[PDB]
């Protein structure tokens, strides 16, 4: 009897040592959207 250790990888990520690899991924980025100005949380705003 044999006992061993144990997918679809569409997402790509950048890595300094391994170059660009296929992987899932956790995005760290966002392109925010232009909105009106507001009051800064912790602080007075003049």
């Amino acid at each position, epitope marked *: 009897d044999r006992i061993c250790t144990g997918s679809n990888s569409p997402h790509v990520v950048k890595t300094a040592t391994q170059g660009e690899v296929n992987v899932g991924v956790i995005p760290l980025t966002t392109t925010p*959207t*232009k*909105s*009106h100005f507001a009051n800064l949380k912790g602080t007075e705003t003049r």
Partner: antibody
Amino acid sequence: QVQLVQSGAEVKKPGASVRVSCRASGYIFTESGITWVRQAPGQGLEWMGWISGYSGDTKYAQKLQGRVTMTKDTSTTTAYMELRSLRYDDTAVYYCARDVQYSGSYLGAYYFDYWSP
Amino acid sequence: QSVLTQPPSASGTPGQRVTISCSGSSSNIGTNYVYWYQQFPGTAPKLLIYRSYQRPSGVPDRFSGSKSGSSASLAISGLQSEDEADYYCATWDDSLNGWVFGGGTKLTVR
């Protein structure tokens, strides 16, 4: 109650100019602005421009720079739109609208609210 | 020739959900907030949806705003006779340095 009241209907020969009036009520005029939008009969809406009720700063639609002028009068809380060199394409209904933005570059980060009749 | 593209006509039997699309580009809908206005004949347009998704007070949850890339959409559910009007989308356009309007869609529910 937020009100906008305009001057009466106008009729003009081609080449003359019109000054349309817009009197404001029910909010702090000096912390808002006016935009103007016009509507050719049976057609869509065309933005004309905006003016600050705080500073008199203006920004006009590219197609109407030269021909249009907006001014405003804090005393009477009234805004005016002047259109020069009228052609037949200038036949339209002229709305004014309360615009939330009153200082900084006018860049469409804000919006306009209530429209006059 | 309008910068934003709206179908001229949209329709549905009463009670149904109809949608109105609005098709733009990177300079306008892609980078800016969308606004929706409703106009009954011979009246001022009225603000119906603001900042792409919001409802002014008075506007029922029947009206719904959507946005994806350079296109926005207005959804009217539970369609009723009093929703017969013209619907206009508007956004700022950074390329033309001014506000832009869709051609307007006429909503017919008999």
